[PDB]
Design a protein around this ligand. Structure first.
Ligand SMILES: CCCCCCCC(=O)O
Length: 181
């Protein structure tokens, strides 16, 4: 069958100030034809808590086989306590499993210039939770994308439209073993 991959993300998955069809999850959907459906449920600026609030309706609506969780970066960019982000992500993972879906957790990291003790503590939540729940820990693309000015919006913060096909292709490669086309 054609399973659904739900992406529960922030602007890194929604695409910042662009059409939904331009963002990498839509490009991935198109690449996969109808082998697997990709539903992007991502909103620019969402905290992990905001994503968690949206999740139950999405699980009921979409009944996904897998849920790619790409959240917590906004919490970290706002200097929220790591334990709160950890706990919120923990709840998301519990809810995804309890809906008979497989969570996939994307590592998030803050930029090299961010406060270092804080950034280490923030980034450590992701391998911790992936081990705790025994779920896939997906790699994070943003630092590589930021190396290409031609893939970044004028702020040097958000990937642009031209980045999206590259991200889609890379994500397709990371997700190949999971969807087993
Ligand atoms: C550096 C951590 C990743 C942050 C991405 C979220 C930005 C936004 O949602 O507008």
């Amino acid at each position: 069958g054609m399973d659904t991959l739900l992406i529960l993300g922030d602007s890194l998955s929604a695409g910042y100030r662009m059409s939904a069809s331009a963002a990498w999850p839509a490009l991935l959907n198109d690449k996969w034809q109808s082998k697997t459906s990709v539903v992007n449920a991502s909103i620019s600026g969402d905290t992990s808590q905001q994503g968690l609030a949206r999740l139950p309706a999405l699980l009921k609506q979409h009944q996904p086989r897998w849920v790619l969780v790409e959240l917590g970066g906004n919490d970290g960019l706002r200097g929220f306590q790591p334990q709160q982000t950890e706990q919120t992500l923990r709840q998301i993972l519990q809810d995804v499993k309890a809906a008979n879906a497989e969570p996939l957790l994307m590592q998030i990291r803050l930029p090299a210039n961010y406060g270092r003790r804080y950034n280490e503590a923030f980034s450590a939540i992701y391998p911790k939770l992936a081990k705790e729940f025994d779920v896939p820990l997906l790699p994070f693309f943003l630092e590589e994308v930021k190396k290409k000015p031609q893939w970044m919006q004028d702020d040097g913060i958000h990937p642009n439209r031209d980045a999206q096909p590259f991200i889609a292709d890379w994500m397709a490669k990371q997700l190949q073993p999971l969807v087993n086309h």
